[PDB]
Each structure stands twice: as C-alpha cells, then as structure tokens.
Write a protein that binds this ligand. Structure first.
Ligand SMILES: CCCCCCCCCCCCCCCCCC(=O)O[C@@H](COC(=O)CCCCCCCCCCCCCCC)COP(=O)(O)OC[C@H](O)CO
Ligand SMILES: CCCCCCCCCCCCCCCC(=O)OC[C@H](COP(=O)(O)OCCN)OC(=O)CCCCCCCCCCCCCCC
Lengths: 431, 51
C-alpha cells in the first residue's frame, strides 16, 4: 500500500491495495455543513438524498455499482463503489451526474418526493435518536453564531424555505475545482492516475470558494431539553480541542483513549480499564461511555458522553468523571500511558485497516483535503510511540485545567446542577 | 464617662473601611456568579398532540 499525488487544476489521490477486490472511485468536496448560513441548513442533505433517490435505479440497471454519500462537517463525499474491472463505467456515470447535466435530476416531482422523504427522516431522527440529538445540541451550543454549530441534517423549519434556487446556488458556489479531489481506493493501479486528469473530463465552473468572515469560536453555553416522558437521561460534556494539522492531534487522541469506553451490560467491560470504572461499579450509576476527541479544519471538541437509567445519580457520575479528568493532568502512571498507547494503536489499526473501500476513501479524502497527502500508518505508529508522560501531562494542563466547558442534555435532567457546580469541580479541589 | 473615644473612633474607621471594601467585593462577586443564571432564556415549543 502506498499513496500518490498529482494535480492539474484539480487534485487526484489513490491508495492502491491489491488484497481487496472492491474498487471505489468518487469525488470529495471540502464544503459541507460548515459552509452554509442558518437560513439554508439542509441543502447538503437534500443534495445527498437527490443523488441517492432516483438515478440509483439507473446505476443498477445500466451497470452494476452501489453509490454512497456522507456529510460530517465539511466533507461532502459522493463515493461510487464498483468491481475491480468496472471503474471506467463508474467514472463515466459520475461525470454524467455532476458535470453534465443536473437539469434532469432537478425536477418538480422528484424534488417534492425527496423533500417529503427528508422531512420524514429528520422528524424520525429528532423523535428517536437521543444520543445523536444531544451531540448535535452540544455542537449547536458550543459554536453559537458561527458556521460550525448548525446541524448536518437541517432544522425542521429550515427545510421548507428553499426549493430550486438555493440548491442550484449551493451547487454553483461550492461544487468547484479548488476544493475537490478524486479518491481511488480499492485495487486500481494507474487508470485513476491518468483518466481523472483529462482535457475536459473534470468538473466545470472554475473558480474559488467564498471566504468565511468568522473562523470559529468556543463559549461555555448550556442547553437543556428537559422532558420527563423519556425513560433515561443523556448528557454530554466537551472542551476546546485542536484542529487537523496540529502537533497535538495524537496527544489529544491518547488522552481520550486513556479513559476509553464502558458498558455495564457486558461481562467483558466491567473488569478492565482505569480507576473511574472501579469507582462506578460499586453503585449502578451509568450505562455507556464515549470519550470522543473530534477535530475539524477550524476547531476540535474533546469531550464525554453517557446515559443513565438512574436519575438521582447524575451528579455523582459527573463529579467522578470530572475528578478523574483533574487527576489526569497531575499524576498518571507510566503503565497507564503504555496501556493507552497500545489501545490507541489497536483502535487506529481497526479504523484504518477495515476492508471497506468507502471508509478508506472517506479517510483519505479527509486527510488529503487539509494537508496534501495522507499520513501513513507506519509514521502514525512511530509518532504515537514518540508520545510520553510529559507530553500528555503538558497537553492536559494546557487544554483542561480550568477551561470553559459546554454541556447538553435531554430526558430526566431534573437532578443536574446547572453550570457553576460542574465548572467549579476542575480547580476547587486540592491540587 | 467614655475614656476610649480616640481608640473607638480609630478602630471604627478601620472597621468601616474594611467592611465597605468587603461589601463592594461581595456585590461584584454576586453580580458575577449570578450572571449565568439571571440571563438564561426559555423557549416553549408545544409538543405533538399524542399522549
Ligand atoms: C448562611 C448559611 C451558612 C452558614 C455557615 C455554615 C457553616 C458550616 C459550613 C459547612 C461547609 C460549607 C463551607 C464551604 C464548603 C465548600 C463546598 C464543599 O466543600 O463541598 C463540595 C465538596 O467538594 C468535594 O468533595 C471536593 C473538594 C474537597 C477535597 C479537598 C479538601 C481540601 C481540604 C479540606 C479541609 C476541610 C475539611 C472539612 C470540609 C467540610 C461540593 O461541591 P463538589 O466539588 O462536590 O461539586 C458538586 C458535585 O457535582 C458533586 O460532588
Ligand atoms: C466560614 C466562611 C464564611 C461562610 C462561608 C462563606 C463562603 C465561603 C466560600 C464558599 C464557596 C466555596 O467554598 O467554594 C467556591 C470556591 C470557588 O473556587 P473556584 O470554583 O472558583 O475554583 C477556583 C479556586 N480553585 O472554592 C473555594 O473557595 C474552596 C474553599 C474550600 C474551603 C473549605 C473549608 C475551609 C476551612 C478552613 C479551616 C480548615 C480547618
């Protein structure tokens, strides 16, 4: 496995892997949910559904290929999987889809059907999925009045205020030749390297992406969605993280991995880990853990999430988690760091070793749209091994000791102290 | 009748100075840490009609 790079007007990337036999080729745009004003929120989701809606029959009829999509914060990706010997067909279909012509794909009936389907889907998401809801609310409350807080699926009222003008405007303003790459993950050697760059076989509308007046921000805002009908209580915490291409990415990832995950209803999860697991097992407080270290091109979010059937025990859980975070920055045994390093090595190996071509293409585009070339796994392992106790202690002291935090919650949140009791528990303790 | 007037007034001046400083300090801190609770806003969205 190796990475190649080249450019003429556009950028072309490829990570050949002859072991797998599922070639996937598609484009990736560096403009998603972070490049849209709050009055135009679900335009990217409408694009995704309108490319997943109607021509999905044509792709399976005329040829054989399964087409996917993904929008996370700015990486609007349209991957077209295929068989190893049928990549040119996928590229030709992608060209006939984007560059010419999208007028047929933009009709009144098709758009109305996509609109009602998207409305039903977003309503269902807002009804059922609670942890994702609290994650989106944490994002929307940490980045108040900033093009990084609005959700990636579109607020309910924002959908029905845009039909054909906003969608085409987004296409003409973001689907450009400056922030687009052509991934080639699979088992293709050099056809992607040559056919992507042609006299006219590239996206039209040469130009530049509009600049953003506001880069990012982070203020400690609290949001609650108290409602006693739900049985459980989902709460999330976060602090300021680091963006991609910073010499703190892997240290933050290791700090997240130190505490790891947990699941009380699994016999293999109650007997491992670090101290807070032991402190929690004595009384049934929590059910799930998710120590996440998210990073975006502007700013990151290193946080925590949980969900408890017990409602009176929320304060104790939050206090114990904050106390453990406090202990992280003063005294960590070298054994803890070694175990966290091994666990993170395994985790990144699983993440970057999965046989899915689509996930590898997504990661490749994500890491190439910011730096220019993907950071290989061997170098990643070497620099992971470079980390020591001093570096993680320094990062924890810099980014955790008495820093502004954001909180979110929903369900039975009657027993959650609002903002000063939680914030005070990071420096009031004897040090 | 009161052989402590000078000492009483000196101690009283010191006491009123220190208590005035403490009172202003408490004013500032109370207006500070109540700022996050005196500004929180509520929005009522009627729930969907299904018990
Ligand atoms: C007008 C009414 C009051 C009149 C006067 C009252 C007189 C009695 C005073 C009783 C104690 C109140 C004085 C101030 C207490 C500070 C708060 C405190 O100690 O309690 C915290 C307890 O804090 C701790 O448990 C950690 C800090 C203590 C560890 C460090 C100790 C240092 C040395 C202490 C010496 C004193 C020992 C006796 C303390 C009672 C609670 O907050 P928390 O950090 O637990 O946050 C809440 C969280 O969500 C749930 O935990
Ligand atoms: C008696 C005094 C009069 C009655 C109490 C009046 C209020 C006192 C402060 C209460 C607020 C509070 O104790 O906790 C809120 C503040 C906020 O600290 P912080 O969150 O801004 O973090 C910034 C600082 N790290 O922390 C404290 O001061 C901790 C003080 C702990 C005192 C424990 C008892 C000490 C006994 C001394 C004798 C021991 C023998």
């Amino acid at each position: 496995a190796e990475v190649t790079q080249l450019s003429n007007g556009i950028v072309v990337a490829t990570e050949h892997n002859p072991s797998a036999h599922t070639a996937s080729v598609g484009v990736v745009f560096g403009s998603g949910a972070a490049n849209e004003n709050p009055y135009n929120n679900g335009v990217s989701n409408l694009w995704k559904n309108i490319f997943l809606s109607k021509e999905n029959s044509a792709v399976a009829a005329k040829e054989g290929l399964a087409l996917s999509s993904n929008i996370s914060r700015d990486f609007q990706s349209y991957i077209v999987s295929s068989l190893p010997g049928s990549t040119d067909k996928s590229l030709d279909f992608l060209n006939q889809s984007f560059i010419q012509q999208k007028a047929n794909l933009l009709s009144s009936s098709n758009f109305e059907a996509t609109k009602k389907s998207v409305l039903k889907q977003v309503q269902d998401f807002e009804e059922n999925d609670h942890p994702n809801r609290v994650l989106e609310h944490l994002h929307s409350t940490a980045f108040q009045n900033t093009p990084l807080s609005l959700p990636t699926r579109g607020t309910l009222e924002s959908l029905e205020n845009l039909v054909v003008a906003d969608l085409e405007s987004f296409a003409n303003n973001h689907f450009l030749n400056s922030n687009a790459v052509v991934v080639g993950t699979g088992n293709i050697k050099h056809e992607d390297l040559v056919n992507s760059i042609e006299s006219k076989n590239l996206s039209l509308q040469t130009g530049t992406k509009p600049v953003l007046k506001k880069k990012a921000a982070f203020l400690g805002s609290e949001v609650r969605l108290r409602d006693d009908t739900l049985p459980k209580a989902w709460i999330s915490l976060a602090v300021e993280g680091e963006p991609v291409n910073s010499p703190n990415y892997f240290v933050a990832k290791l700090a997240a991995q130190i505490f790891g995950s947990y699941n009380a209803f699994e016999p293999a999860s109650r007997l491992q880990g670090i101290k807070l697991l032991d402190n929690i097992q004595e009384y049934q407080l929590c059910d799930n853990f998710n120590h996440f270290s998210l990073s975006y091109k502007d700013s990151g979010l290193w946080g925590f999430s949980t969900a408890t059937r017990n409602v009176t025990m929320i304060d104790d859980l939050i206090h114990f988690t904050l106390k453990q975070w406090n202990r992280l920055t003063i005294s960590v045994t070298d054994t803890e760091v070694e175990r966290a390093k091994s666990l993170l090595k395994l985790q990144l190996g699983q993440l970057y070793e999965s046989g899915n071509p689509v996930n590898d293409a997504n990661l490749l585009g994500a890491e190439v749209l910011i730096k220019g070339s993907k950071l290989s796994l061997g170098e990643a392992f070497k620099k992971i091994d470079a980390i020591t106790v001093k570096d993680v202690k320094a990062w924890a002291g810099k980014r955790l000791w008495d820093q502004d935090i954001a909180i979110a919650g929903t369900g039975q949140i009657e027993g959650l102290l609002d903002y000063m009791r939680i914030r005070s528990d990071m420096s009031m303790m004897r040090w | 009748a009161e052989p402590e007037h000078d000492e009483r007034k000196r101690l009283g001046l010191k006491t009123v100075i220190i208590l005035s400083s403490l009172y202003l300090l408490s004013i500032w801190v109370k207006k500070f840490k109540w700022a996050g609770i005196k500004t929180r806003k509520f929005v009522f969205n009627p729930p969907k009609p299904r018990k």
